[PDB]
Design a protein around this ligand. Structure first.
Ligand SMILES: [K+]
Ligand SMILES: [K+]
Ligand SMILES: [K+]
Ligand SMILES: [K+]
Ligand SMILES: [K+]
Ligand SMILES: [K+]
Ligand SMILES: [K+]
Ligand SMILES: [K+]
Ligand SMILES: [K+]
Ligand SMILES: [Mg+2]
Ligand SMILES: [Mg+2]
Ligand SMILES: [Mg+2]
Ligand SMILES: [Mg+2]
Ligand SMILES: [Mg+2]
Ligand SMILES: [Mg+2]
Ligand SMILES: [Mg+2]
Ligand SMILES: [Mg+2]
Ligand SMILES: [Mg+2]
Ligand SMILES: [Mg+2]
Ligand SMILES: [Mg+2]
Ligand SMILES: [Mg+2]
Ligand SMILES: [Mg+2]
Ligand SMILES: [Mg+2]
Ligand SMILES: [Mg+2]
Ligand SMILES: [Mg+2]
Ligand SMILES: [Mg+2]
Ligand SMILES: [Mg+2]
Ligand SMILES: [Mg+2]
Ligand SMILES: [Mg+2]
Ligand SMILES: [Mg+2]
Ligand SMILES: [Mg+2]
Ligand SMILES: [Mg+2]
Ligand SMILES: [Mg+2]
Ligand SMILES: [Mg+2]
Ligand SMILES: [Mg+2]
Ligand SMILES: [Mg+2]
Ligand SMILES: [Mg+2]
Ligand SMILES: [Mg+2]
Ligand SMILES: [Mg+2]
Ligand SMILES: [Mg+2]
Ligand SMILES: [Mg+2]
Ligand SMILES: [Mg+2]
Ligand SMILES: [Mg+2]
Ligand SMILES: [Mg+2]
Ligand SMILES: [Mg+2]
Ligand SMILES: [Mg+2]
Ligand SMILES: [Mg+2]
Ligand SMILES: [Mg+2]
Ligand SMILES: [Mg+2]
Ligand SMILES: [Mg+2]
Ligand SMILES: [Mg+2]
Ligand SMILES: [Mg+2]
Ligand SMILES: [Mg+2]
Ligand SMILES: [Mg+2]
Ligand SMILES: [Mg+2]
Ligand SMILES: [Mg+2]
Ligand SMILES: [Mg+2]
Ligand SMILES: [Mg+2]
Ligand SMILES: [Mg+2]
Ligand SMILES: [Mg+2]
Ligand SMILES: [Mg+2]
Ligand SMILES: [Mg+2]
Ligand SMILES: [Mg+2]
Ligand SMILES: [Mg+2]
Ligand SMILES: [Mg+2]
Ligand SMILES: [Mg+2]
Ligand SMILES: [Mg+2]
Ligand SMILES: [Mg+2]
Lengths: 64, 326
RNA sequence: UCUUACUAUAGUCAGGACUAUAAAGGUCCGAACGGGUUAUCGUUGCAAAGAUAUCCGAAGAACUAUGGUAAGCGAGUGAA
RNA sequence: CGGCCUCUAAGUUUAUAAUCUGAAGAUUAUGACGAUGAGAAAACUUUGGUACCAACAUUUAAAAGUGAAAAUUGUGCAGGAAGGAUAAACCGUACCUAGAAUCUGAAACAA
RNA sequence: AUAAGGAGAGCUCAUUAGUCUCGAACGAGUAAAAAGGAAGAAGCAUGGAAUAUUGUUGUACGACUGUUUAAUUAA
RNA sequence: AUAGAUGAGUUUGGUGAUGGCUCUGAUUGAACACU
RNA sequence: AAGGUCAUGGCUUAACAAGCCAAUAAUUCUCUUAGUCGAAGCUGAAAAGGCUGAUCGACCACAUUGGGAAUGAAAAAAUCC
RNA sequence: GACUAAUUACGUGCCAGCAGUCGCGGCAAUACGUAAGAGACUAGUGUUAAUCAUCAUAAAUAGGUUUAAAGGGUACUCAGACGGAAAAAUUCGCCCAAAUAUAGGGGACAAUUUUUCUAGAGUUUUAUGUAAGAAGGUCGUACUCUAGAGUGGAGAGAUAAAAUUCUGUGAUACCUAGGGGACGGGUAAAGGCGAAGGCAAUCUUUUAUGUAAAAACUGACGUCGAAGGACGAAGGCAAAGGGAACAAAAAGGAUUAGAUACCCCAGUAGUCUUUGCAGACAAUUAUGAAUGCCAUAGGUUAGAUUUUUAAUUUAGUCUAUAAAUGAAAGUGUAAGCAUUUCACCUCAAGAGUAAGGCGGCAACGCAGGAACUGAAAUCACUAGACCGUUUCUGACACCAGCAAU
RNA sequence: AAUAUUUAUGU
C-alpha cells in the first residue's frame, strides 16, 4: 500500500490514507505486546532484524 | 527551513524580492536547454545600423529600437527537403525567436541543421521529413500507392514534416506553409499551432478518402480558416516555449537589453510633433486616437490594402470590436 | 571635429558591506569618474557659465576613446 | 617600435553589371577602398563544448606574496565580430602636456 | 535596519595551545606575527591630529533605479 | 445525636412537561425611616 | 576515590560517564482578585455541605514608599544605614 | 385582592398613586387616598443590602443532551480512564479500625508481577456478494460546431398568453461526412459498499476493512479517547488547461399598483482536468462510540446447513407489537434495563456579537465574554377554527331557460 | 394521465 500511494497519482488516493495508518497502528499494537511478552527472546530479535522493524514503528506515536 | 532564492511555482520562475526591479521578474522554466554555444557555421552576426531601426537611407524607419545585446542569427531550416531520419542533438535557445530550436543531425550524411523545436521534443528524438516523397520501404509495406490510415500511423509523429494532405483532420501543426514549394510561414511562434479543418477529397468506394482538389483548409493561430496548398509543408506538434507570453521583465533595463527603446506618448509631445500634442495640462484635445502620421489607432480601422483581397480565406477572423475580454 | 540618437571597434569603474551564489542584484557605504541639489562669491568675472563648500549616481537604462551614419520645401535627432 | 604593407568591421564608392527614375540620380549584387581591431618567427629570427575568446568568477610560470599576460574550469542570461591566414627601402623619432613661457577656451585665461 | 539607543578604542604589563626564532623532550625569547584580562600608569582630554554633516514623526505627489530645458525652472 | 429530609405564586385557548424568577425559613460587627 | 558529618545527602573536591525531571505544561510569563485557617461566626435535614475570614485562638506579612546590613544565644524591632 | 393571617364606607376615575411575584385604577375600586374595624409583632416594628436554605438551579453523594438549553463532521490513535477465566508472589491496599496508630490478624476484592486457560480481540484456509478508494484507457445516447455549391423554400422557437430573439448571408424540418466537450438510459430494490464526507456506463491494473461455514493458530494482545495529525459536501480563492451543456453576476423582454424577483430571449464567473489553499453544512438516525442483557411476528439483503420441494441458522437492514419506557409524540436490535468513555448544556434576550489572540492570499474559521433590558422564553399533546386543502352532503348556490334591474 | 395569468391590506 505504501508503494501504491507513491506511484503515479498515488497522492490522489486520499481514502486509503487511513488504510496505511490503520496497518501501521495495528502493527504497533502487536509489537508493543510482543515486546513485553517475549522478554527479548531470540524469537523476538529474529523478527526485527529480518523485517527491519525499528523502534520508531511501535515505541512512540505513529503520526501520518 | 528557509525559502530558496529561486522559487519554482508551476512552470514559471520567481526570485526573492530583494530589489524593487526583481520583484516582478518571471521566467519560464526551461532547464533542458543546451547551455553551450550554438553551432557557429550555422550562424552569422546581427550588426549594423539596422539594429537601431534604420534603413539604407540612415533614417529611423522603425522606432523604439537600438542599444540591445550583441546577437547572432541562426539559420533555421524552414523547408526541410532532405529526406531520411534526423537525430535531435540538443534543444537550444534562440535570442531572435520566441520558440526554441533543435540541432538535428542527418544520420545518412551527418550534416547538422536547425529546426523549430516542438513542445516536448527532447534530445535523442528522431524526426523525419516526408516532403520530398515517401521512401521505398514505406510504400512497399502497404504495397499500394498510398493508404491514409496506414501512412498517418507511421509518419504523423511529433516533429515530422509532411504535406498537409497526408496529415489527418484534427491534427495540430505548427510550421504550416502556403505555397507548394515554399517555406513554413504560419504558427512559427512560441506556443502557436494550427488545426486541419477540411481536405478537398472524395471517397474511393472503399471508405478510403482520396485527394480530389488542390488545397486544404486550416485554422490558424488567429482563428482564421484559410485555404492552403495540398503540397504545403507542416510539422506535427506545437511550437515549444508555450509559457513565453507569461514572462515578465520586471524592470526597464531588461527591455533595453532586448533592443527596445522608450516609447514616448503622443500626449507628451507638442502640437508640432504629434496630432495629440498641445494643451495646458493633461488634455487629449478631443482628437480621435491616431498615429504620428494620421493613421487611426483605434476603432477598427483596417490597415490591409483594400484592393489586396485575400482569395485564400474561407472564414475571416473574428473582430472583437473593442469589447473587453476579461 | 559641438550636441541628440544609432552604429562598429575598444577601454574604464580603489576598497569595503549585505544578499541564494566563488561568479545570478537597474543592491548598500564610499574614491577615481560622471552629475550639478543648496548657499555664498563673482557679474566691464580667472571664466560670453568660473571658484569654494555642500549634495547626488558610482556593475549600470553606466561612463569614456577613435571612426561611421542621419539635418534644413517635406523636418534630422529627441526617456519629449 | 609604430607607420607603410597583408586582412577585414561600421560604412563609403563619377568602378562594373542589372534594374528603377522629370534630369540630377537611387537601388541590388560584385569589386575596390576603408581601424577605433587582427597580422608568422627571435638574444638571436627571416573541426564548432572534439568549441569559443563577450561579461563575471575561479585556477595555473612551484620558496612565499603581489601585479599582468595567456590559458583552464565554471556560472548567469541579456546568449556574447569579420576576414586573411602562419641582407634588409621609404615615413615618424626635436621640444610643450598645462601652478609657471608651447595643446582647446578670441589670450601669457583660477576652465 | 548601519533603525533608534548603547559599549569599546591609545601607552605599559601579568598571562601563551599552536605557528616562528634561539639554545640544548625541555628551557628561553615579541630585537617575531598575534592572542589577552574586572591588571596598571600619566594627562583637562587616550574615535589622541586629518578624513565620513544630526536623529525622529505626520502628510501630499510620483511605485521604485533612471531621464529632461548644454548656459535662470531636476520637479 | 435515631428524626432529619416538606412546599407556594407565576408561561398556555386549555392539558401535561421543561425551565427560570419571586415568596415562605434562619440570620447580620448592618444602615435608613417611624418610634 | 578522598574529605566532611553522630549519621545521611555533590554536603564539598578531583577524575570519568551524559545523564536526571518532564512530555496531557514539568518550567516560565502576563493579567484580575485575595491576608490564611479553625463547629471561630452565620446557615442547611444532610453532603470531605455552603458563605464569611469581625470580636476568640494559631499562622503569615507590614509599620510613609522603595533599596540594604549588622549586633545578638536567637531578628523574632514601632530600632539602625 | 391572591400568594398570606385580617372589612366595610366615602373620595378619586388608566388621573393621583400602590406594587416582593401575578397585578390594581378607564364614574356603583374588598388592591389607590382618608375614616373605622379586623389580623399580627412589640421596645421594638417595617424597609433596603447581603449570606445560607428554597434550588437535584453546575447533581462527587446526585442531573441531563430524538422532537424542550446540550452529542463533536469522521474514527485511526500518544497521554489518560476502563476492561476476561483458574492459581500464585508481593503490597497489606481494603476490613477489624482507630487518634494522620506501634505491632498484628482476616483474603473475598484492589494494585505491580508470575504461571496457565480460551468465551473477548485477532491471524491462516484465493469465500460468496459488493456504486468504498485510485491509476491508465475506452464505449454509447443526445447535444454542439463545421462542411455538402445537400433535399426543401417561409417560417421557427419561446410562453398561461406574449415580447425580446433566430431566419432569405436559406433557418425550423429530413439526411450525409467529420470535429469537439462534459454527462451515464435501462437493470434498480424496504438493495448494497466505506470511519464519515460520500460512492451507480465500461475494460485492464491497483487498495484496507467487513460477512458465512469449518478446522487450525496466537493467548487478553481489548474498548473509549483531550490534543496533534489525517480525511472532510457544495460553493469559494490561486495557477495552468478545457469550454458542448447548464448557469450566480451584469444586461434586455414581460408580468405587476410597483417587481430587485417568480416566467422568457440570451449570458460571464463557476461546475469539468491538474496542483495547492480553505475546513464552515439540516456534515442527520435532529439520536457519539463501545460492551453485557430482554418477549414475539411479517418482509427483505449476503451466506451456511438440511429429507435443498421447504425448513433451521449466522451477520445486516426495515415495518408492526409484548413486557417496559417516555411530558407525550412515540421507541421497543432502544429514546428499555445496566456499564465504560469522550464531547457538550445550566432562564430568555444581548450573542456565537465585542475586544485581544491564533489560522488563512482572501473570503472567513477556531476560540469566546461583559454591560444594558426582561418574567417569562420553550417542548409535546387536546378540541375547535382556518387553508388560492382533499373528498362528500344540502340550498335558484350555480348551470340552463324565462322575466326583470 | 405532466396541466400552470393576476388575489396586497385589516389601532
Ligand atoms: K553611493
Ligand atoms: K534620374
Ligand atoms: K590644473
Ligand atoms: K545633462
Ligand atoms: K452527529
Ligand atoms: K496482612
Ligand atoms: K500459553
Ligand atoms: K427512560
Ligand atoms: K458586543
Ligand atoms: Mg478525481
Ligand atoms: Mg513600438
Ligand atoms: Mg509601453
Ligand atoms: Mg510612454
Ligand atoms: Mg510639454
Ligand atoms: Mg496637428
Ligand atoms: Mg485641465
Ligand atoms: Mg547601486
Ligand atoms: Mg559685485
Ligand atoms: Mg541611493
Ligand atoms: Mg583591403
Ligand atoms: Mg589600427
Ligand atoms: Mg592658450
Ligand atoms: Mg591655465
Ligand atoms: Mg587624573
Ligand atoms: Mg519619481
Ligand atoms: Mg532618482
Ligand atoms: Mg538650465
Ligand atoms: Mg539648476
Ligand atoms: Mg398554542
Ligand atoms: Mg487586598
Ligand atoms: Mg484577621
Ligand atoms: Mg386570606
Ligand atoms: Mg399601602
Ligand atoms: Mg399572567
Ligand atoms: Mg387602600
Ligand atoms: Mg429586649
Ligand atoms: Mg469541528
Ligand atoms: Mg456542527
Ligand atoms: Mg491483604
Ligand atoms: Mg487450542
Ligand atoms: Mg474469535
Ligand atoms: Mg470476492
Ligand atoms: Mg440549393
Ligand atoms: Mg443549410
Ligand atoms: Mg469523447
Ligand atoms: Mg449521507
Ligand atoms: Mg442507471
Ligand atoms: Mg459495511
Ligand atoms: Mg478505537
Ligand atoms: Mg482530536
Ligand atoms: Mg471543493
Ligand atoms: Mg473549485
Ligand atoms: Mg481560473
Ligand atoms: Mg440581475
Ligand atoms: Mg428583469
Ligand atoms: Mg441558457
Ligand atoms: Mg487540507
Ligand atoms: Mg467519538
Ligand atoms: Mg430480519
Ligand atoms: Mg441498506
Ligand atoms: Mg418500529
Ligand atoms: Mg444565550
Ligand atoms: Mg473577533
Ligand atoms: Mg465556536
Ligand atoms: Mg388538530
Ligand atoms: Mg338568487
Ligand atoms: Mg342564467
Ligand atoms: Mg393585525
Amino acid at each position: 500500500l505504501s508503494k501504491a500511494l507513491e506511484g503515479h497519482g498515488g497522492n490522489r488516493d486520499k481514502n486509503n490514507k487511513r488504510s496505511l495508518r490503520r496497518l501501521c497502528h495495528k502493527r504497533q499494537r502487536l509489537l508493543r505486546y510482543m515486546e513485553r511478552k517475549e522478554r527479548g527472546s531470540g524469537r523476538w530479535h529474529h523478527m526485527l532484524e529480518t523485517l527491519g522493524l525499528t523502534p520508531a514503528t511501535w515505541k512512540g506515536q505513529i503520526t501520518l | 527551513i528557509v525559502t530558496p532564492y529561486v522559487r519554482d511555482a508551476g512552470m514559471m520562475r520567481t526570485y526573492k524580492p530583494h530589489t524593487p526591479g526583481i520583484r516582478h521578474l518571471k521566467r519560464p522554466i526551461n532547464d533542458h536547454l543546451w547551455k553551450g554555444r550554438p553551432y557557429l557555421p550555422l550562424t552569422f552576426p546581427k550588426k549594423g545600423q539596422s539594429k537601431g531601426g534604420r534603413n539604407h537611407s540612415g533614417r529611423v524607419t522603425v522606432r523604439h529600437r537600438g542599444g540591445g545585446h550583441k546577437r547572432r542569427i541562426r539559420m533555421v531550416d524552414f523547408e526541410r527537403w532532405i529526406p531520411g531520419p534526423h537525430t535531435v542533438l540538443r534543444i537550444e535557445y534562440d535570442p531572435g525567436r520566441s520558440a526554441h530550436i533543435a540541432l538535428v543531425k542527418e544520420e545518412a550524411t551527418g550534416r547538422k541543421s536547425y529546426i523549430v523545436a516542438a513542445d516536448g521534443m527532447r534530445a535523442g528524438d528522431v524526426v523525419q521529413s516526408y516532403r520530398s516523397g515517401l521512401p521505398q520501404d514505406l510504400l512497399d509495406s502497404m504495397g499500394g500507392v498510398v493508404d491514409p490510415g496506414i501512412l498517418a500511423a507511421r509518419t504523423c509523429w511529433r516533429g515530422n514534416c509532411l504535406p498537409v494532405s497526408m496529415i489527418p483532420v484534427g491534427t495540430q501543426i505548427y510550421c504550416v506553409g502556403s505555397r507548394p514549394d515554399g517555406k513554413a510561414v504560419f504558427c512559427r511562434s512560441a506556443g502557436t499551432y494550427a488545426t486541419i479543418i477540411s481536405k478537398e477529397e472524395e471517397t474511393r468506394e472503399d471508405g478510403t478518402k482520396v485527394m480530389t482538389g488542390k488545397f486544404v483548409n486550416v485554422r490558424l493561430q488567429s482563428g482564421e480558416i484559410r485555404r492552403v496548398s495540398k503540397d504545403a509543408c507542416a510539422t506535427v506538434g506545437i511550437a515549444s516555449n508555450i509559457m513565453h507570453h507569461y514572462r515578465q521583465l520586471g524592470k526597464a533595463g531588461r527591455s533595453r537589453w532586448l533592443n527596445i527603446r522608450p516609447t514616448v506618448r503622443g500626449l507628451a509631445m507638442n502640437a508640432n510633433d504629434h496630432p495629440h500634442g498641445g494643451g495646458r495640462g493633461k488634455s487629449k484635445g478631443n482628437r480621435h486616437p491616431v498615429s504620428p502620421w494620421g493613421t487611426p489607432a483605434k476603432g477598427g480601422y483596417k490597415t490591409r490594402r483594400k484592393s489586396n483581397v485575400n482569395k485564400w480565406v474561407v472564414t475571416p477572423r473574428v473582430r472583437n470590436m473593442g469589447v473587453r475580454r476579461n
